Amino acid sequence: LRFGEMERDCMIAHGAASFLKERLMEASDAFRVHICGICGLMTVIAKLN
């Protein structure tokens, strides 16, 4: 189901900042990525193994 733009606003008016976050990252598509600390570009070649 869609968490629309207006649902986002209604959640802001409630002030529920954490739910707004969880509903937007945990509940949809979080993604860890690495970034260079100099050129802040997702260009790190992580061999995290």
Partner 1 sequence: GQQYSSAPLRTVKEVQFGLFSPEEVRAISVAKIRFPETMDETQTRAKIGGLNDPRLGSIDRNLKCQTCQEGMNECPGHFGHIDLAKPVFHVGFIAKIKKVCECVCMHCGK
* CA–CA gap between residue 38 and residue 48 (Å, rounded): 19
CA distances from 42 to 19, 22, 28 (A): 27, 23, 21
Contact pick of 1, 2, 38, 47 for partner 1 (by CB under 8 A) = 47
Site membership for Zn ion, residue 33 (CB under 5 A): no
Task: Pick the closer one to partner 1 by CB: 18 or 43.
Answer: 43
16, interface contact from partner 1, Zn ion, none, CB < 5-8 Å by kind: none
Residue 11's CB is within 10 A of a number of other CB atoms, namely 17
- Contact stretch for partner 1 (CB under 8 A) within 2-10, 13-21, 38-46: 38-46
